[PDB]
């Protein structure tokens, strides 16, 4: 559906196509061939410094999915309840009305407190319960 080709469309239609937004995110139309006899020019330095910032934005979120059991797929749920105090709108309502665009501007605040809680109930509690529950 195109790179960010679902950003305009509502959350429901945005969750419908979000693989392309991660597909062309790394090696798409920016990777290229990457081809006086020296490569220490202004274009050589700029491409390698940008390469470091390229992986940094991917790995930051990649590590999080890995410590949530959501690493194996694009969309995976967790065993974390939603504290009503964060957002008071209906599940189905933001999906055809608010859109991911405004929605990120709503969570961004408690987003770090959400990430903190996501680590324990789904991994620090769920995967730590396995140690005893695996053999019975």
């Amino acid at each position: 559906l195109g790179f960010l080709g679902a950003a305009g469309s509502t959350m429901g239609a945005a969750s419908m196509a979000l693989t392309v937004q991660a597909r062309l995110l790394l090696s798409g139309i920016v990777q290229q061939q990457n081809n006086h006899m020296l490569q220490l020019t202004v274009w050589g330095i700029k491409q390698l410094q940008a390469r470091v910032l390229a992986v940094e934005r991917y790995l930051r979120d990649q590590q999080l999915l890995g410590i949530w059991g959501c690493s194996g797929k694009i969309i995976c749920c967790t065993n974390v309840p939603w504290n009503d105090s964060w957002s008071n709108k209906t599940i189905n309502e933001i999906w055809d009305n608010m859109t991911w665009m405004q929605w990120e501007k709503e969570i961004d605040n408690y987003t770090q407190h959400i990430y903190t809680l996501l680590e324990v109930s789904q991994i620090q509690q769920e995967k730590n319960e396995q140690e005893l529950l695996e053999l019975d």
Partner: nanobody
Amino acid sequence: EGQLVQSGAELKKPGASVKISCKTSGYRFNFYHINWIRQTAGRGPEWMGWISPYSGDKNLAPAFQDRVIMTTDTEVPVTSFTSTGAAYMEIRNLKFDDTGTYFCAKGLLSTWLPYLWGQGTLLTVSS
């Protein structure tokens, strides 16, 4: 919660062409649909028609087809979400049964339905 500005106190004699306007403020006018309704003196509100400001789709009642023809303009963006637009309603060959209160309504997203209404335009179709 968004506020609507409904242009009022306009009325004329039967048979003549009536033009009713409404200014939209403090919301994304583009993806939000626009609904138009009227209520007679016999407490029976007749649903006039449904119009879309992003696409040319429309749904209108058979009693309001040849008589009623609606139009909409392009959105004027204020922020990355908020915009300003307007909708016009033209009615031809009016009767004393058409006399009543005419309202403009803001859309929802099961999306075709409204969410918020305007002040009200009391149309008096009298000679």
